[PDB]
Structures are given as structure tokens and as C-alpha cells.
């Protein structure tokens, strides 16, 4: 096992959880991988592949996301900051998906779902662009339930790292659907003690965070250093107790052990 791969067995090991670890480096497509083909629960990290499914189809319908959405009471799920402001009125979808992203709206969240024909319209957007491994069944909030060795909203780190690099670096998305979803990532709010709070200041950085059932802390990061290739980097990270806390430090941890490596 590499040096990098010893401290973050390290990590892992004085956690008591289940740490997953996908960095790409862009420069010259090394990779470094800790259970990288082991299933993890999403949770909120597949807010991402709903709103490049969305962002996908603009490709073809220009305004759709100036199109409204009506937010009605029976609407409402737990952890929706921004779509209960807006209760008995719309959203657009762009602001719907900025609220998704930036603050994990789940009630937002599921609109996108709906927009895509239900969770397989999800899953399909994942297939059509290569990655076989994301699958979303279920919508919000139940996709948290992260059971352990359940298969339900799971993705692999090697295969969401990979599907991360083609949305916002390659050209799984058209150059301005692209350029939308990074800003949106830079502008994440929820990140500041995650993967964020483990990297030097100097690199740019965009994120989406997952957390849910066991203790289920996660975050997947598009990151930009001056004067080289930009890396992509997915920390995933379940406990064994149901009722376990967040642990965003252990993301920082990894992190900071990725970069110093």
C-alpha cells in the first residue's frame, strides 16, 4: 500500500467507521483510491447528478430553468430552508437547483426529481453519460436512511469521482450547462467544515455534502490549486451505530492527508 493509503487506513482506523477515497489529478490521470470500488449511501451528494440531469435537459429546452414551480405545503420535506420561504408560491427551476446545491434543500431536491420523470430519470442521466454504478431509488428523505449494505442510493467513490470530472471538467454537460453547475458548487454553503476546512486557502474550491443515517458524512469536491491541473476528490464516510453523529472531520482529515500527499 502506498504512503497516502497507510494514513488514510490510519484515519479510517482511529474513526471506528467505513472511510471512502477517490482523487483523480487531472494532470496525469493518477488516482488514488481507498475502498474506491466499495458502495457508500449519497445522501445529499446526488443532489448533483439531479441538477446536471436538469441542467442536461436545458441543453435542448432553452428556458426551462427560468420555468416556475409551484411549492405547495404537502410539498414541504425536513432540512428545506429555502422552499419553505416559498410556500404557496414558485421556485424556478435554476433556483431550485441553486437551493438543492448551495444550501441541500430536500424539498428542492425533489422537484428536480420530479422534473426528471421520478428517481429512475435520475439514474438514467448517470447511465447516459457512463457511469454504471450511480443508482437513486428513492426520493427525499428517505434516500438517507443509509443502511449499511443496503444498495439503494449508492455509488461507488471510484465511479462518482469520475462522474464528477465529466460534469464539471469534461463535457458531459454543454460548455454553459458546465460552467453553471461550477459556480453553483463554488457557491456551496454547507461545506466550511468538510473537505474545505482541510485543504490550503489558495485553491479554489466546489463542493455539494451529504449526511444521513449512521452517522453518514460525505462530500464531493471540484478543486482548482494555482499552477496545476485541478484534482477531483470524493470522501465518503458511514458509521456503525444508526444513530451516530456527523463527523465532517473526518472529510478534512482525508482531505488534508490528499493534498499533503
Known amino acids: 500500500?502506498?504512503?497516502?493509503?497507510?494514513?488514510?487506513?490510519?484515519?479510517?482506523?482511529?474513526?471506528?467507521?467505513?472511510?471512502?477515497?477517490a482523487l483523480i489529478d487531472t494532470a496525469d490521470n493518477t488516482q488514488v483510491l481507498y475502498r474506491g470500488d466499495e458502495r457508500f449511501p449519497m445522501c445529499?451528494?446526488?443532489?448533483?447528478?439531479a441538477a446536471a440531469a436538469v441542467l442536461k435537459q436545458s441543453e435542448t429546452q432553452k428556458q426551462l430553468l427560468n420555468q416556475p414551480v409551484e411549492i405547495k405545503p404537502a410539498d414541504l420535506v425536513n432540512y428545506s430552508p429555502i422552499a419553505e420561504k416559498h410556500v404557496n408560491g414558485t421556485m424556478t427551476l435554476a433556483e431550485l437547483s441553486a437551493a438543492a446545491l448551495q444550501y441541500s434543500d430536500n424539498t428542492a431536491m425533489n422537484k428536480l426529481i420530479a422534473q426528471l420523470g421520478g428517481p429512475g430519470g435520475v439514474t438514467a442521466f448517470a447511465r447516459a453519460i457512463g457511469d454504471e454504478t450511480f443508482r437513486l431509488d428513492r426520493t427525499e428523505p428517505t434516500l438517507n436512511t443509509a443502511i449499511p449494505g443496503d444498495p439503494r442510493d449508492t455509488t461507488t467513490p471510484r465511479a462518482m469521482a469520475q462522474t464528477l470530472r465529466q460534469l464539471t471538467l469534461?463535457?458531459?454537460?454543454?460548455?454553459?450547462?458546465?460552467?453553471?453547475?461550477?459556480?453553483?458548487?463554488?457557491?456551496?454553503?454547507?461545506?466550511a467544515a468538510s473537505i474545505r476546512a482541510g485543504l490550503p486557502t489558495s485553491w479554489t474550491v466546489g463542493d455539494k455534502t451529504g449526511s444521513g443515517g449512521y452517522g453518514t458524512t460525505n462530500d464531493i469536491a471540484v478543486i482548482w490549486p494555482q499552477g496545476r491541473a485541478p484534482l477531483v476528490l470524493v470522501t465518503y464516510f458511514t458509521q456503525p451505530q444508526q444513530n451516530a453523529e456527523?463527523?465532517?472531520?473526518?472529510?478534512?482529515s482525508?482531505?488534508?492527508?490528499i493534498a499533503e500527499g
Open 1 to 21: 500500500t502506498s504512503a497516502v493509503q497507510q494514513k488514510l487506513a490510519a484515519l479510517e482506523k482511529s474513526s471506528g467507521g467505513r472511510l471512502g477515497v
Open 254 to 257: 482525508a482531505a488534508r492527508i
Open 170 to 191: 469534461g463535457h458531459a454537460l454543454g460548455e454553459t450547462q458546465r460552467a453553471q453547475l461550477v459556480t453553483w458548487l463554488k457557491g456551496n454553503t454547507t461545506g
Open 246 to 252: 456527523s463527523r465532517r472531520d473526518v472529510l478534512a
Open 44 to 49: 445529499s451528494t446526488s443532489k448533483v447528478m
